[PDB]
Amino acid sequence: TREEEWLDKRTKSQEKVYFDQEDRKAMKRLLEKLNTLEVENILKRYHINYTQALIDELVDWKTG
Amino acid sequence: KRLLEKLNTAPQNLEVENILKRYHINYTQALIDELVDWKTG
Numbered sequence: 382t383r384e385e386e387w388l389d390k391r392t393k394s395q396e397k398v399y400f401d402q403e404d405r406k407a408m409k410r411l412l413e414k415l416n417t418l419e420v421e422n423i424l425k426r427y428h429i430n431y432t433q434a435l436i437d438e439l440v441d442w443k444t445g
Numbered sequence: 446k447r448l449l450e451k452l453n454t455a456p457q458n459l460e461v462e463n464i465l466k467r468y469h470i471n472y473t474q475a476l477i478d479e480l481v482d483w484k485t486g
Binding site for chain 2: 419420423424427429430431432434435438439442443
């Protein structure tokens with residue numbers, strides 16, 4: 382017999398769901414607002430899609 | 446002058462290739478040769 386806990390959980394649960402969606406929109410809006418290296422060039426010449434991880438290894442491979 | 450006139454006239458390839466394998470990206474000998482030359486440069 383604990384109804385106070387029931388209301389407390391309902392409050393935290395619904396608030397999280399509501400603001401969780403708002404967090405997504407907030408990131409998209411601020412990201413769109415903010416929108417408006419040797420290994421990087423060589424790979425672009427070969428028009429090969431390169432991930433950030435691959436760039437790190439090649440740089441480490443040279444320095445190492 | 447005479448000696449001056451006379452002077453005037455693989456593993457790294459495997460390392461880079463293995464890396465390109467892990468990312469399953471298309472690799473060509475020209476790219477590997479340049480990266481190898483890029484390492485020495």
